[PDB]
Design a protein around this motif. Structure first.
Motif, PDB file in Angstrom:
ATOM      1  N   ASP A  85     -39.298 -45.915  27.086  1.00 19.20           N
ATOM      2  CA  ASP A  85     -39.183 -46.351  28.491  1.00 19.20           C
ATOM      3  C   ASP A  85     -39.982 -47.589  28.890  1.00 19.20           C
ATOM      4  N   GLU A  86     -40.925 -48.031  28.059  1.00 19.87           N
ATOM      5  CA  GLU A  86     -41.707 -49.227  28.399  1.00 19.87           C
ATOM      6  C   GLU A  86     -42.393 -49.882  27.211  1.00 19.87           C
ATOM      7  N   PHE A  87     -42.742 -51.150  27.372  1.00 20.78           N
ATOM      8  CA  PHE A  87     -43.468 -51.866  26.338  1.00 20.78           C
ATOM      9  C   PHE A  87     -44.880 -52.059  26.811  1.00 20.78           C
ATOM     10  N   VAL A  88     -45.834 -51.727  25.960  1.00 18.96           N
ATOM     11  CA  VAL A  88     -47.216 -51.798  26.372  1.00 18.96           C
ATOM     12  C   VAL A  88     -47.995 -52.814  25.565  1.00 18.96           C
ATOM     13  N   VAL A  89     -48.617 -53.741  26.288  1.00 19.17           N
ATOM     14  CA  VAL A  89     -49.544 -54.685  25.687  1.00 19.17           C
ATOM     15  C   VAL A  89     -50.981 -54.242  25.990  1.00 19.17           C
ATOM     16  N   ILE A  90     -51.772 -54.119  24.919  1.00 21.13           N
ATOM     17  CA  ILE A  90     -53.090 -53.475  24.952  1.00 21.13           C
ATOM     18  C   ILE A  90     -54.272 -54.403  24.636  1.00 21.13           C
ATOM     19  N   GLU A 148     -50.793 -44.943  26.371  1.00 21.49           N
ATOM     20  CA  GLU A 148     -49.762 -44.063  26.915  1.00 21.49           C
ATOM     21  C   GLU A 148     -50.267 -43.363  28.158  1.00 21.49           C
ATOM     22  N   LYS A 149     -51.584 -43.190  28.237  1.00 25.40           N
ATOM     23  CA  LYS A 149     -52.188 -42.416  29.312  1.00 25.40           C
ATOM     24  C   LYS A 149     -53.379 -43.119  29.959  1.00 25.40           C
ATOM     25  N   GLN A 150     -53.827 -42.551  31.071  1.00 22.61           N
ATOM     26  CA  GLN A 150     -54.991 -43.040  31.784  1.00 22.61           C
ATOM     27  C   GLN A 150     -55.746 -41.825  32.291  1.00 22.61           C
ATOM     28  N   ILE A 151     -56.961 -41.635  31.797  1.00 17.17           N
ATOM     29  CA  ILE A 151     -57.700 -40.431  32.114  1.00 17.17           C
ATOM     30  C   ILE A 151     -58.935 -40.779  32.919  1.00 17.17           C
ATOM     31  N   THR A 164     -60.205 -49.969  27.043  1.00 13.49           N
ATOM     32  CA  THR A 164     -58.793 -50.221  26.793  1.00 13.49           C
ATOM     33  C   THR A 164     -58.043 -50.570  28.075  1.00 13.49           C
ATOM     34  N   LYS A 165     -57.845 -51.860  28.319  1.00  9.90           N
ATOM     35  CA  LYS A 165     -57.038 -52.310  29.456  1.00  9.90           C
ATOM     36  C   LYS A 165     -55.585 -52.420  29.002  1.00  9.90           C
ATOM     37  N   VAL A 166     -54.646 -52.123  29.897  1.00 13.56           N
ATOM     38  CA  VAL A 166     -53.249 -52.048  29.488  1.00 13.56           C
ATOM     39  C   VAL A 166     -52.251 -52.586  30.523  1.00 13.56           C
ATOM     40  N   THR A 167     -51.313 -53.399  30.042  1.00 18.42           N
ATOM     41  CA  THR A 167     -50.245 -53.946  30.867  1.00 18.42           C
ATOM     42  C   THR A 167     -48.911 -53.461  30.291  1.00 18.42           C
ATOM     43  N   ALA A 168     -47.998 -53.039  31.169  1.00 18.90           N
ATOM     44  CA  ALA A 168     -46.770 -52.379  30.727  1.00 18.90           C
ATOM     45  C   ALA A 168     -45.482 -53.028  31.220  1.00 18.90           C
ATOM     46  N   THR A 190     -19.655 -53.629  28.923  1.00 12.88           N
ATOM     47  CA  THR A 190     -20.684 -53.212  27.974  1.00 12.88           C
ATOM     48  C   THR A 190     -21.914 -52.834  28.780  1.00 12.88           C
ATOM     49  N   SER A 191     -22.888 -52.197  28.131  1.00 13.25           N
ATOM     50  CA  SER A 191     -24.256 -52.110  28.649  1.00 13.25           C
ATOM     51  C   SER A 191     -25.200 -52.388  27.507  1.00 13.25           C
ATOM     52  N   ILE A 192     -26.217 -53.200  27.764  1.00 16.75           N
ATOM     53  CA  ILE A 192     -27.116 -53.666  26.709  1.00 16.75           C
ATOM     54  C   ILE A 192     -28.559 -53.223  26.931  1.00 16.75           C
ATOM     55  N   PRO A 193     -29.148 -52.552  25.930  1.00 22.83           N
ATOM     56  CA  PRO A 193     -30.542 -52.102  25.947  1.00 22.83           C
ATOM     57  C   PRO A 193     -31.501 -53.255  25.703  1.00 22.83           C
ATOM     58  N   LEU A 194     -32.168 -53.697  26.760  1.00 23.75           N
ATOM     59  CA  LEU A 194     -33.215 -54.680  26.630  1.00 23.75           C
ATOM     60  C   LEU A 194     -34.554 -53.971  26.753  1.00 23.75           C
ATOM     61  N   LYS A 195     -35.314 -53.934  25.663  1.00 26.04           N
ATOM     62  CA  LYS A 195     -36.602 -53.243  25.699  1.00 26.04           C
ATOM     63  C   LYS A 195     -37.632 -54.089  26.431  1.00 26.04           C
ATOM     64  N   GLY A 196     -38.728 -53.454  26.847  1.00 22.59           N
ATOM     65  CA  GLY A 196     -39.730 -54.093  27.686  1.00 22.59           C
ATOM     66  C   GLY A 196     -40.360 -55.340  27.108  1.00 22.59           C
ATOM     67  N   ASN A 197     -40.210 -55.530  25.809  1.00 24.44           N
ATOM     68  CA  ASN A 197     -40.816 -56.666  25.147  1.00 24.44           C
ATOM     69  C   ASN A 197     -39.966 -57.938  25.136  1.00 24.44           C
ATOM     70  N   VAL A 198     -38.981 -58.042  26.030  1.00 25.92           N
ATOM     71  CA  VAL A 198     -38.056 -59.177  25.960  1.00 25.92           C
ATOM     72  C   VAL A 198     -38.309 -60.288  26.983  1.00 25.92           C
ATOM     73  N   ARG A 199     -38.378 -61.517  26.481  1.00 25.52           N
ATOM     74  CA  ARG A 199     -38.739 -62.662  27.309  1.00 25.52           C
ATOM     75  C   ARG A 199     -37.701 -63.768  27.196  1.00 25.52           C
ATOM     76  N   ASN A 200     -37.738 -64.680  28.164  1.00 26.53           N
ATOM     77  CA  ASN A 200     -36.830 -65.822  28.201  1.00 26.53           C
ATOM     78  C   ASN A 200     -35.404 -65.342  27.997  1.00 26.53           C
TER      79      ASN A 200
END
Length: 483
Positions: free
Chosen positions: A54-59, A200-203, A366-370, A423-433
């Motif tokens: 469901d998401e791409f995470v940059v850590i 994946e989480k924040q505690i 651990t800072k995280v952007t999603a 059609t429907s196309i799966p673009l994952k969270g890591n896609v740019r430009n």
């Protein structure tokens, strides 16, 4: 004043003055004895690229160090018999760790003062003739049930409330914050660090102290004033007591109810801080905002020590449901259930200065952007041949932590497609430009092709529906976003 024999009679006042003189003679470094420097493992880090469902995470592992210095020692165990107001403890690592070595030797009578509201001063002082968990707890408890009638019930007597929160990053960070013996309730809190590491989480881990009363002891005039004359310097030495290993006494203990609480969310929406903080004050900014979105992805496990038959409830009450109820259970001290030790402070026997524990460590922050996964839909309902040109980049992070764009493009790019196509196309969270160009054949010979849509760097929304229709000369297009 000496004895003929040259000996110092056990049970005589000379022995107690031998002890007294022994303690005063001691020289030690208070600060040095009570200091722990945790893992100073402070290195360098890499940016990491991780793909959740469901998401791409940059850590972004940044580097920090928590360091605290308090005189208050928090209680983990529910009926520690060593932790009685007046107890002598040895300054060790054992003390540094909330697992102190008691010094039960023959103990002189001590006088305590307890701070209950509605207590004629004269009736706040308890003389205990032979101090020990049994005798001290016996004395205050007698007093309480007596105070329980002529005040306690006929008044709302509110517990001192004490809030304290941190964002779990590691176990040794939590320990510097909450105390060296946190691991116990930490491991009960089910704090999944592995998933904070991977983004994946924040505690967040809050702590609620509710203080009913606090029983204290005044400064001891003379160090050997705590021992019966039957205790001798040689007895102290038999038990390892020296200046290398001096002793403190517990100068007050606060009794009540404590609850450690874990808020685990899967929402890496960096604005969780207020989502948690709000919920704590019972306030309800209602659905369906971002706050009521986060809190529904929120699990809560809790340990509760206090105000009950002397044990702990590791409850996992489920969702943000039972929190008002937790922060409410035992808010008023009634004197029916005289709560347990919740916190305690020690002062050196020699000179009465209160002992303060310096603790520190480095923890991996651990800072995280999603980047949320998305879908791109095409619908071709038009009276013409069309051709799509759909292109983007997949952002990765190589071992060595740098930014790699491995360009992709849609499989059926450049082919002729005719209504009704979809059609429907799966673009994952890591896609740019992201780029989409759509041209239509008009049949005219002086303008064979005519571009009907063209956008570079398309924002990766949750659902985008580009639909072309109409005729060769009058094409129409929609670019329909949803979130």
């Amino acid at each position: 004043h000496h004895h003929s024999s040259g000996l110092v009679p056990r049970g005589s006042h000379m022995a107690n003055k031998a002890v007294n003189d022994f303690i005063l003679a001691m020289n030690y470094d208070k600060k040095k004895l009570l200091t722990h420097q945790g893992e100073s493992i402070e290195n360098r880090f890499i940016k990491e690229g991780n793909q959740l469902p469901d998401e791409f995470v940059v850590i972004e592992r940044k580097k920090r160090s928590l360091s605290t210095n308090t005189s208050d020692i928090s209680v983990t165990a529910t009926n520690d018999s060593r932790l009685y107001p007046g107890a002598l403890l040895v300054v060790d690592e054992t003390l540094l760790e909330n697992n102190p070595t008691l010094l039960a030797v023959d103990r002189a009578p001590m006088t305590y003062s307890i701070d209950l509201p509605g207590l004629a001063s004269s009736d706040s002082f308890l003389q205990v003739e032979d101090p020990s968990n049994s005798s001290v707890r016996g004395a205050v408890n007698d007093l309480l049930a007596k105070w329980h009638q002529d005040y306690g019930q006929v008044n709302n007597v509110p517990a001192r409330m004490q809030y304290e929160k941190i964002t779990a990053h590691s176990m040794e960070q939590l320990k510097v914050k909450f105390g060296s013996d946190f691991e116990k309730t930490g491991n009960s809190l089910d704090i999944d660090f592995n998933s904070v590491h991977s983004g994946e989480k924040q505690i967040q881990i809050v702590n609620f102290k509710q203080i009913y009363y606090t029983v204290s002891v005044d400064a001891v005039k003379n160090p050997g004033d705590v021992f019966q004359d039957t205790v001798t310097v040689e007895d102290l030495k038999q038990r390892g007591i020296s200046a290398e290993r001096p002793l403190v006494y517990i100068s007050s203990v606060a009794y009540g109810r404590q609850v450690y609480l874990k808020l685990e969310t899967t929402s890496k929406s960096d604005e969780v801080e207020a989502a948690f903080e709000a919920l704590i004050k019972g306030v309800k900014v209602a659905p369906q905002t971002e706050w009521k979105q986060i809190l529904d992805n929120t699990e809560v496990k809790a340990v509760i020590l206090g105000g009950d038959p002397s044990s702990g409830a590791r409850v996992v009450t489920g969702k943000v449901d039972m929190v008002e109820d937790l922060i409410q259970e035992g808010s008023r001290f009634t004197a029916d259930h005289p709560g347990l030790p919740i916190s305690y402070t020690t002062s050196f026997l020699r000179d009465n200065v209160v002992a303060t524990f310096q603790n520190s460590t480095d923890y991996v922050e651990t800072k995280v952007t999603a980047y949320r996964n998305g879908d791109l839909l095409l619908d071709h309902s038009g009276a013409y041949v069309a051709q799509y040109y759909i292109t983007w980049n997949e952002l990765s992070y190589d071992h060595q932590g740098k930014e790699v764009l491995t360009p992709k493009a849609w499989d059926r790019n450049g082919q002729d497609l005719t209504a009704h196509f979809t059609t429907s196309i799966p673009l994952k969270g890591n896609v740019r430009n992201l780029s989409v160009k759509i041209r239509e054949c008009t049949g005219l010979a002086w303008e064979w092709w005519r571009t009907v849509y063209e956008k570079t760097d398309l924002p990766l929304v949750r659902k985008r529906t580009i639909s072309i229709w109409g005729t060769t000369l009058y094409p129409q297009v929609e670019d329909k976003v949803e979130n």
